[PDB]
UniProtKB/Swiss-Prot annotation, chains A, B:
Disulfide bonds join C4-C48, C7-C21, C15-C38, C22-C28, C55-C67, C61-C79, C68-C73. This is Neurophysin 1. It comes from Bos taurus.
């Protein structure tokens, strides 16, 4: 499954939702300017997925100790380095 | 009680948790550098609370359509402008 659009500082992050941009060395931007770019993903035909490890309920580790779904992010030890 | 520590671009944000910094016109920074000072609240012996309207489970509207508790943020219509 294709990875979602890249985003944020130095394009070092990937989109996890229409308005969620994360990276292991960035943390997560939720609804900030850095994640505006992620709104483009929804006008793209194919499905995308960011992150590798499944966590929480339908989410994916997006950053150090952080688990995100396209709807939000929460703290999750399972996502620690 | 008092609002939590200021954070983010030009002190416009407030802390909703150890690694959560949000502002109405900024969105939320979760685990990003912008939220680093937020972990300092932990050292303050007085209780704090940001946001004005409660939402979700122990959360508070932190930004346009976004609800955050000290350990996460999710899209929440109740928190819409
Ligand atoms: N490419 C978009 C839309 C789409 C969804 C499902 C099937 C085909 C196309 C997409 O994959 N959206 C994601 C969620 C998402 C992730 C990042 C982002 O910046 C915006 C949306 C999905 O629904 O799987
Ligand atoms: N000052 C801290 C610790 C404390 C909690 C309760 C009573 C007395 C002291 C604090 O108020 N923590 C918050 C949660 C929080 C908010 C913002 C932040 O950056 C980090 C933690 C609380 O429990 O109300």
């Amino acid at each position: 499954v294709r990875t979602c659009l890249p985003c944020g500082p130095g394009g070092k992050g990937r989109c996890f939702g229409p308005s969620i941009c994360c990276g292991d060395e960035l943390g997560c931007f939720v609804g900030t300017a850095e994640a505006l770019r992620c709104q483009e993903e929804n006008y793209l035909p194919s499905p995308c997925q960011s992150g590798v490890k499944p966590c929480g309920s339908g989410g994916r580790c997006a950053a150090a100790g952080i688990c995100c779904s396209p709807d939000g992010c929460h703290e999750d030890p399972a996502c620690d380095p």
